[PDB]
Design a protein around this ligand. Structure first.
Ligand SMILES: C[n+]1cc2c3c(ccc2c2ccc4cc5c(cc4c21)OCO5)OCO3
Ligand SMILES: C[n+]1cc2c3c(ccc2c2ccc4cc5c(cc4c21)OCO5)OCO3
Length: 570
């Protein structure tokens, strides 16, 4: 006989609660911005404006009692805790000695990072991405980059998710020495310095919390009170649409690898491994961890770092220790967690790690079979060839010869096949290896006909510097261009060359190029024909499948060719 409560929606945070508490309106240290709680804190205001208020309240979710407390006036705030994410029909009843009166039910949201409170994501995928019926046992992976939401304008809902088995989310940095990040210019180092305030060295943080969880995405139905937004809420809704899709954070990458060189100290690994366990208990849509240390032994962005005696053993121990941690998570959750790593495949990268030892702890190795040549110097070559190109010298392919100064080759040439063969020869199983496809070209300028030693092959020429271009043509940094830019502005509809470019294909290497003879602009990339060759190669050798880098640069053609190559190789 009290008055039935009316819920005050706006005074109760619009009934949007969360096990994860996330700063939405500042940028500060990761530990100050993100706190995961085992029980969500719930606070619901209700009113009984007329009649008697009664003396006690009970709160029900789907008919089950979850809280009780005192009513002592016409406005009551019910505060309590609840441990399970989801949408629930809440009722609140007011009671006195004569009986109880129950509010009408209203949906309350308890957000959790597995996306249990979210409907499947609505997709907005370019229809140039076709449908395929590729065997679900074959890996078809890609990287999605956190910053792709800015100028590139490529969001989670744009991914052709039914054509993917694995999304690697790039990149998760590690706090500590990060001089390489500084060298990149822009805001990347400053963002990282902020994220690490109040964080121990060697622990992981989110690099860009605005992209990751604050940015409101209209297409995902985000509104002001949504407790998780950004890429991560979209990935959580994506897991609701595609529960078998694996989404894996990639830690490191070319510019964020500097802290890994301290993992020769076990205390640093322990700190890192513990922080990765916590990260996966916080962000539960993630299904494992990908380690992208570029590179054990050195030769990466950090010119003064690299230990060829100790980095390999440290990498193996890291993999062993991550696998131990992941087994604890598998025990705690009943889920499967994957451990993978993207690795350099030049012979001088491979020779610094016993991968046959490391891979016993891993589900997959993503072989970085790209970036073999590029704008960092003036030597053209195929950046992502399967085999040795016509432009290589006698003995250069297997490393048994000498260069044009007469200096001995130090090892086999950089090609996908040489890398894969080196890894198989160490005893890495073929069905653990995933072969990489590039969705971008690298490029030079100044490779004009007068520099060529063979007049029909621009790979025999010499450049004056990196390719220059604008972001409108897909050039986001000097010397690199999106595959979709190459297609729009160099190849054209018929794949025969536009704007002064001609197309060529080195059949021995399995590698395409476009070349503008007058500017001497030359771009090495992967196309439909080279990606079919890679699929046939993967099939022949019984590799795990294919992956690509990076998905925002594709227009559908590369991922389609990955699927086509994996169906049809003889
Ligand atoms: C050898 N490397 C590899 C890299 C690399 C990256 C990104 C940057 C680099 C890099 C950047 C600056 C450098 C500067 C250097 C150098 C090497 C590098 C260098 O030699 C000494 O002067 O993705 C992984 O592979
Ligand atoms: C592979 N390298 C060798 C270099 C180098 C230098 C100076 C710079 C580089 C460099 C710079 C940026 C790079 C960026 C890259 C890369 C490789 C490099 C890279 O591969 C992935 O993206 O003098 C000694 O030899």
């Amino acid at each position: 006989a009290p008055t039935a409560p009316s819920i005050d929606m706006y005074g109760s945070n619009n009934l949007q609660f969360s096990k994860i508490e996330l700063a939405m309106e500042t940028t500060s240290g990761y530990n100050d911005m993100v706190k995961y709680h085992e029980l969500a804190k719930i606070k619901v205001k209700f009113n009984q404006w007329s009649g008697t208020s009664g003396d006690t309240y009970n709160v029900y979710f789907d008919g089950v009692k979850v809280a009780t407390g005192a009513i002592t006036g016409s406005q009551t705030t019910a505060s309590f805790e609840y441990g399970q994410g989801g949408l629930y029909q809440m009722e609140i009843e007011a009671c006195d000695a004569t009986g109880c009166s129950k509010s009408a039910p209203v949906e309350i949201t308890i957000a959790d990072t597995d996306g249990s409170h979210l409907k499947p994501l609505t997709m907005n995928v370019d229809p140039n991405n076709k449908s395929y019926n590729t065997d679900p046992s074959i890996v078809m992976g890609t990287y999605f980059v956190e910053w792709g939401i800015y100028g590139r304008d490529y969001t989670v809902d744009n991914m052709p998710v039914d054509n993917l088995t694995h999304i690697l989310y790039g990149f998760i940095p590690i706090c500590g020495p990060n001089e390489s990040v500084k060298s990149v210019g822009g805001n990347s180092f400053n963002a990282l310095q902020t994220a690490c305030r109040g964080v121990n060295d060697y622990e992981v943080v989110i690099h860009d919390p605005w992209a990751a969880y604050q940015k409101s995405f209209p297409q995902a139905g985000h509104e002001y009170s949504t407790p998780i937004k950004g890429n991560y809420a979209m990935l959580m809704a994506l897991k609701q649409r595609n529960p078998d899709l694996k989404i894996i954070p990639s830690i490191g990458g070319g510019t964020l690898s500097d802290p890994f060189y301290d993992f020769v100290d076990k205390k640093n690994r322990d700190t890192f491994v513990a922080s990765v366990k916590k990260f996966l208990k916080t962000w539960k849509f993630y299904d494992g961890v990908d380690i992208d240390w570029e590179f054990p032994g050195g030769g990466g962005a950090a010119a003064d770092k690299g230990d060829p005696v100790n980095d390999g053993p440290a990498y193996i121990a890291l993999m062993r220790e991550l696998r131990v941690m992941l087994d604890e998570l598998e025990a705690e959750t009943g889920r499967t967690y994957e451990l993978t790593s993207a690795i350099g495949v030049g012979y001088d990268k491979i020779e610094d790690v016993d991968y046959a030892d490391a891979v016993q702890y891993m589900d997959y190795i993503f072989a970085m079979t790209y970036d073999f040549y590029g704008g960092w110097n003036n030597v053209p070559g195929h950046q992502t060839a399967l085999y040795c190109g016509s432009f290589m010298r006698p003995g250069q392919c297997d490393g048994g010869g000498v260069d044009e100064n007469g200096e001995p080759y130090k090892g086999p040439a950089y090609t996908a096949d040489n890398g894969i063969q080196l890894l198989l020869a160490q005893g890495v199983p073929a069905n653990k290896l995933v072969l990489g496809t590039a969705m971008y070209g690298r490029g030079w300028e100044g490779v004009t006909p007068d520099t060529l030693t063979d007049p029909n092959d621009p790979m025999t020429g010499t450049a004056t510097g990196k390719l220059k271009g604008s972001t409108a043509q897909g050039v986001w940094e000097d010397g690199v261009i999106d595959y979709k830019g190459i297609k729009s502005f160099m190849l054209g509809a018929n794949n025969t060359g536009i704007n002064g470019f001609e197309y060529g294909y080195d059949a021995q290497a399995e590698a395409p190029w476009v070349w503008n003879r007058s500017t001497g602009e030359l771009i090495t990339f992967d196309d439909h024909r080279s990606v079919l060759a890679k699929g046939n190669y993967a099939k022949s050798l019984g590799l795990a499948g294919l992956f690509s880098w990076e998905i925002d640069a594709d227009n559908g053609d590369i991922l389609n060719a990955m699927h086509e190559g994996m169906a049809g190789g003889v």
